[model samples]
Target: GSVHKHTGRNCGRKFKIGEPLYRCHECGCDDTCVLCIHCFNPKDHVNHHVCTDICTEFTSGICDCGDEEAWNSPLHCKAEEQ
Candidate 1:
């Protein structure tokens, strides 16, 4: 039960190994650029789909990546959450 975090477009901004990843600037709306998995080059696009189950968990507010929600939610409900 380890947590992972990522930043930037295409999940390339920031991330840790062995954690689920979701929407990223690199992937954009294209079916390319798999999940948070690391890709050697941004040009080498890969057709991938984000598992709904994984996304749901992320939406539920579990994966903490210092995003807006993570800051506002119970995880880090500080006055300056964001």
Candidate 2:
């Protein structure tokens, strides 16, 4: 499928429309949560859960990596401010 890109706090970095991202279904956010390729590395999701790579179809918002309320797991990227 496809999803829109977003910008926010922390890895609050905005991604390109064709940029590749990773999604973690095990994190409890369902389709609402996603991580850019950089943030995806530190989590090492390969052995821990069911995750997939997705390409952003649009650019208009932010990613959910640092959003604690959106994830059951801790932030994938180290966030000094939480």
Per residue, candidate 1 scores C-alpha lDDT tens digits across 6-81 of 4341222333434544444433343222233332222323342234223333333233333333222212212121
Candidate 1 lowest-lDDT run of ten: 72-81
Best by TM-score: 2
1-82 per-residue lDDT for model 2 (tens digits): 2422333554655666776556666674666677765565444465556555545565334556667776787654533223
Cα RMSDs, all models: 13.8, 7.2
Per-prediction TM-score to the true structure, in the order listed: 0.21, 0.58
Query: Which residue pairs does candidate 1 place in steric collision?
Result: 6-14, 7-13, 7-14, 9-25, 9-26, 10-24, 10-25, 10-26
Query: How high a TM-score does candidate 1 get?
Result: 0.21
